[PDB]
Point group: C3
Chain length 92, copies 3
């Protein structure tokens, strides 16, 4: 009977330890992220991958310059056409 | 003996609870994501970071326009070279 | 008493199993990721989203070409201005 009495005492401590350990795990699991809600390394773009990313302002800077050239080229077409007539007129 | 009998009954319920609690944690852990497979907030680019991203079609749009200008500039070179000769011829 | 003796034996094995099961979970939790440190699917850009990303070298390539055109257009302006004076001069004298 004293053998059984001790066993019970051993079980009590063991159960008590388990209770504590499970409680911890309960708390700790609260802070963990689910597979559903989180994104994998394989399917996500790192900050490394976008280090050499072009902005919409870089492109805007180029658009600006393109427009300026486009405008200058139009003016030149106008000037050249006029000169062709002027030279033609001179030849007659 | 009735004291020990009750203790055993108390342990039984406690063990039963723990069994359930651990099973839950087993299940719940199944849906959690590992550190290895998931990507950290620090090393991943958010949708905010890529809000002002330039596309390859923005650039294609610019390339198109560049090619058009390139053609117009060639034509102009041709027209101007001819005019220079025509004017030179007129001066002699 | 032998009924109680057996119950205790049943509890011992069950406790022993639980001890092992909890230890595993302890270990396994060590390799799991926290909500704080990880990034959600909703707030992160996938490799799909950046498949059509423009580089800074693409842009550099365009800048190079733009500069070449810019130079040619300046030269043309110069050539045309000179011709206008030359033709004007021809019309007067």
């Amino acid at each position: 009977m004293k053998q059984l009495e001790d066993k019970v005492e051993e079980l009590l401590s063991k159960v008590y330890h388990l209770e504590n350990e499970v409680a911890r795990l309960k708390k700790l699991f609260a802070e963990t992220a689910t597979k559903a809600e989180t994104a994998t390394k394989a399917e996500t773009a790192t900050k490394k991958d976008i280090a050499g990313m072009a902005t919409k302002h870089d492109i805007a800077q180029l658009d600006k310059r393109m427009k300026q050239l486009e405008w200058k080229v139009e003016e030149l077409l106008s000037k050249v056409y006029h000169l062709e007539n002027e030279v033609a007129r001179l030849k007659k």
